[PDB]
């Protein structure tokens, strides 16, 4: 279930342990998914109010939303989580292909006329 986006069922299993305590393991598991939701807020979403992403984990209103809201963005606002969905700068690169392809075309010319 951790492979796909099964989250809520995983937090049902969390507790729904039939075998024994497993507490030290499900607390590492309680974290290594805390940073996972703490990344899952960072996708292209709308203005999330102070209830939805407040209750997606397992909290009512501590300052753990201040721990993550000051750790990452989606900053504390007027019932507001801020979307800095920019994704702008990285395209329009010809020069890096104008170096790599400058390598590759010469590599074509090496095994084309030069006898091997």
């Amino acid at each position: 279930y951790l492979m796909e986006g099964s989250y809520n069922k995983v937090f049902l299993a969390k507790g729904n342990i039939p075998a024994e305590s497993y507490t030290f393991f499900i607390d590492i598991l309680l974290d290594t998914i805390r940073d996972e939701i703490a990344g899952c807020i960072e996708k292209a979403y709308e203005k999330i109010l102070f209830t939805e992403a407040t209750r997606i984990l397992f909290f009512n209103t501590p300052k753990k939303m201040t721990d993550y809201a000051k750790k990452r963005g989606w900053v504390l606002g007027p019932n507001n989580y801020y979307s800095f969905a920019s994704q702008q700068q990285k395209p329009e690169d010809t020069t890096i292909p104008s170096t790599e392809l400058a390598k590759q075309v010469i590599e074509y010319a090496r095994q084309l006329e030069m006898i091997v």
Partner: protein
């Protein structure tokens, strides 16, 4: 004054710098293209013009430092890109 990054300006800015109204600057810039001191295009709906070529002016001993420095790293691009051709293309010609 505007660099080669944009060199694209608006009729509001022209109306400010020449303090003349909106419905005269087009008649000014068509005259400027007719003289041929400037070469560019006119968009009307976005109120911007794409100036490309300008009349070459004169300058002091300060701008030649800028053209010196623009020349300078333009040299090392030829050095750096040429060195890939020398080093990588070495087995094709001794």
């Amino acid at each position: 004054t505007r660099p080669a990054n944009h060199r694209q300006l608006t009729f509001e800015e022209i109306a400010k710098s020449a303090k003349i109204t909106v419905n005269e600057v087009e008649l000014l810039v068509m005259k400027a293209l007719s003289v041929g001191l400037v070469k560019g295009s006119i968009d009307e709906v976005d109120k911007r013009v794409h100036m490309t070529w300008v009349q070459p002016r004169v300058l002091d001993l300060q701008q030649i430092k800028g053209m010196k420095d623009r020349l300078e790293f333009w040299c090392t691009d030829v050095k750096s890109m040429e060195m890939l051709v020398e080093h990588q293309a070495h087995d094709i010609l001794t």
